[PDB]
Amino acid sequence: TEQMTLRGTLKGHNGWVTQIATTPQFPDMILSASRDKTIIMWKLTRDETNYGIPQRALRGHSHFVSDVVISSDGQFALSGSWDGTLRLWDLTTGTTTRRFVGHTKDVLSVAFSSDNRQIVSGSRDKTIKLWNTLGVCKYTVQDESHSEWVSCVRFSPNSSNPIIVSCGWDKLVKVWNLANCKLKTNHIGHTGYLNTVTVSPDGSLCASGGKDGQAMLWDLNEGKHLYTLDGGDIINALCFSPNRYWLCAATGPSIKIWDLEGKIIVDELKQEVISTSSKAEPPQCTSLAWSADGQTLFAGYTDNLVRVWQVTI
Amino acid sequence: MGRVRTKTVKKAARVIIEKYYTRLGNDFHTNKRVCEEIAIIPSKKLRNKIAGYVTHLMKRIQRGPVRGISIKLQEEERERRDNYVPEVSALDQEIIEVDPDTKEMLKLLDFGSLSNLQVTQPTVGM
RNA sequence: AACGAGACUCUGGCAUGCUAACUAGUUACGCGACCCCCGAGCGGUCGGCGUCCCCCAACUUCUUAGAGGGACAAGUGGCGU
Ligand SMILES: [Mg+2]
Ligand SMILES: [Mg+2]
């Protein structure tokens, strides 16, 4: 039986942990964006007395850091914060190489191309923006876009003809041809705003969740709606699997991991159960990331902690 | 000290909740932006105070309903209880039964079945 | 329902984030020069002092002043019909 176990916990932050990103190149370094305006790059010392130390704090941002992603080579990082600016870092020293100015409101999401050639950003301006990798504005989706906050944008991993997909606060999942930057199709449903969106590594499904609490699976090839999983409380971040057919979902205080084959829950990752003497008892779950080894997942919470969960047999 | 909010803040927060109930959450830094985008507050301090009272109201609406804001989700749970429910049934057992001087009364309007009796101690408090 | 209180305006505290500056500067070395060995050394090369002189050097940390941000009893524990 495949089970999950709490290996260790990482400390060093001061506010909420908002994003976690791992690269398949270096299996011993993690990026963690937090609400204390810093981005911590970790020294993942695999011991068990602790589990990791912050290696370097990428500083320089005037508000919350909402999104971060590592490049394909492991030498750069892209970040998007709540002052409208995007930053291209250097994982060797710091020294933000290029800031991507141009927005009127906070920057929510950020995503990197398959070859790290274009950049995409969604903000609260109801504007999706494409950028050259030199710090200039390539294209802007001004209208036919969402009517509310564009909460998340992602690239498809396919070399076969290219998709980008965006979810918003207008309870819609919109999909775009990347060459043309026009709409391909709509996706209706999801009563309530949308928190996240993701594409499977095979580039064939989009698992979208939000306030509703139900994770919906959409097909990127058929242009239909496959099926729905009621995730229970609420969905913060949905992430697919690197070497399995699961789907990890971040509910309020828990993490729900489905076997998609017969669409059945495998586990409910609940932390410790102190009798919290009033009010909302547990620190809620913000983000989660699967390691390229497919063996351990990292989860960033709202109480300044980053917890590890290892697959055990 | 102070920290007592004014009617201009409380009424604004109550209206903001009663219209945009589904956009508001439990954290302050998001309710701030929501109220910033849905309303027109002509100051930043007032915006923060309104968004801070909205959070304190939301933390309560998750419990029992407050008595100044009416939403749709919390009205159905009243409506669907004000219509009949299987907790209630009919008159609980339809073999209800009486005492004398009621049978003596019922006899004066022609009733004749399905009753009982009892006689008490002869006056109060004995 | 109205006035007064509050809200409001100026001000003090914070930004290694933005905007940009020989009527403000920093650092760098181009420097060049003075001086002392005060260090290894020779005294030179390396350094140490400079409101001494230059840069069509790179920058805005200190100075200036604009735009935004940021604090809300928001978080946690008690006391509260
Ligand atoms: Mg009155
Ligand atoms: Mg309290």
XYZ file of C-alpha atoms in Angstrom, chain B residues 14-120:
107
model
C -23.043 45.711 6.595
C -24.065 46.810 3.098
C -20.829 45.493 1.564
C -21.480 42.110 3.173
C -25.178 42.019 2.318
C -24.469 42.521 -1.393
C -21.095 40.849 -2.091
C -21.385 37.984 0.357
C -19.665 35.389 -1.848
C -16.558 37.413 -2.746
C -15.490 37.978 0.867
C -13.334 35.538 2.798
C -11.576 35.367 6.180
C -8.266 37.232 5.562
C -7.913 40.994 5.732
C -5.507 41.734 2.878
C -7.949 40.305 0.320
C -11.146 41.813 1.718
C -9.299 45.131 1.542
C -8.856 44.791 -2.233
C -12.392 43.460 -2.731
C -13.994 46.420 -0.957
C -11.564 48.679 -2.819
C -12.820 47.397 -6.165
C -16.558 47.109 -5.458
C -17.137 50.410 -3.633
C -15.788 53.980 -3.667
C -14.227 54.862 -0.302
C -12.731 58.395 -0.518
C -9.841 57.662 1.873
C -7.430 54.875 2.723
C -7.901 54.831 6.503
C -11.658 54.452 6.049
C -11.015 51.642 3.562
C -8.887 49.759 6.083
C -11.429 50.223 8.873
C -14.315 49.025 6.690
C -12.301 46.032 5.474
C -11.329 45.227 9.055
C -14.902 45.247 10.288
C -15.942 43.110 7.307
C -13.513 40.410 8.448
C -14.811 40.500 12.025
C -18.354 40.119 10.697
C -17.393 37.267 8.358
C -15.786 35.368 11.263
C -19.229 35.513 12.906
C -21.453 34.689 9.924
C -19.683 31.272 9.764
C -21.335 30.605 13.168
C -24.976 31.426 13.963
C -26.542 34.195 11.895
C -26.294 37.816 12.994
C -29.415 39.959 13.305
C -28.609 42.808 10.923
C -27.478 41.119 7.703
C -29.692 38.896 5.545
C -28.064 36.609 2.972
C -29.388 33.903 0.667
C -27.490 30.894 2.024
C -28.684 31.499 5.598
C -32.325 32.180 4.551
C -32.826 28.751 2.905
C -31.897 27.011 6.189
C -34.776 29.025 7.802
C -37.247 28.605 4.910
C -36.600 24.824 4.612
C -37.215 24.554 8.413
C -40.382 26.774 8.422
C -41.878 24.295 5.939
C -42.802 21.014 7.737
C -40.059 18.507 8.779
C -40.015 14.776 9.832
C -38.933 15.848 13.384
C -42.619 16.965 13.947
C -45.161 14.304 12.643
C -48.938 14.825 13.358
C -50.414 15.333 16.873
C -47.851 13.020 18.483
C -50.231 10.157 19.474
C -53.872 10.538 18.275
C -55.224 8.767 21.462
C -55.154 11.940 23.662
C -57.299 11.614 26.772
C -59.129 13.811 29.313
C -60.342 14.149 32.919
C -63.834 14.416 34.455
C -65.830 17.641 34.126
C -64.569 17.524 30.547
C -66.365 14.270 29.798
C -69.212 15.939 31.682
C -68.767 18.874 29.298
C -68.393 16.692 26.198
C -71.615 14.896 27.148
C -73.434 18.224 26.802
C -72.342 18.383 23.137
C -72.773 14.696 22.254
C -69.357 13.044 22.433
C -68.940 9.395 23.356
C -65.604 7.613 22.783
C -61.817 7.284 23.318
C -61.105 9.029 26.677
C -59.855 8.335 30.213
C -60.131 9.871 33.689
C -58.392 10.848 36.914
C -59.413 12.517 40.248
C -56.832 14.684 42.156
